[PDB]
Amino acid sequence: NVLSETVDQTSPHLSAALDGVARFSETIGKRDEDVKKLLASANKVATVLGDR
């Protein structure tokens, strides 16, 4: 009964959340190599900054 009530209540607000999460996740998901290269170079530069 609790699962039925939760799905009944949260259904009308689910499609917009799915669409927004899909769009924002695909913003980064189609740039995986660029993001990882950015993280590596940022690791190098930030390590240089933090050590000094």
């Binding site: 993001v35 290269k37 950015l38 170079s41 940022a42 530069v45 240089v48 050590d51």
Partner: protein
Amino acid sequence: VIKNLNTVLDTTVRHQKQFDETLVNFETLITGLKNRADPIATSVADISD
């Protein structure tokens, strides 16, 4: 943002050794100047006068 930050970061990484050394060298130079700042400023003012 990702593209331009990647460009700047790889440019910095290419000279990472020099970018690391210049911080320490600049700190040493500026500390050495600060330890004599008052005579240096007095001397500059006297030169101008």
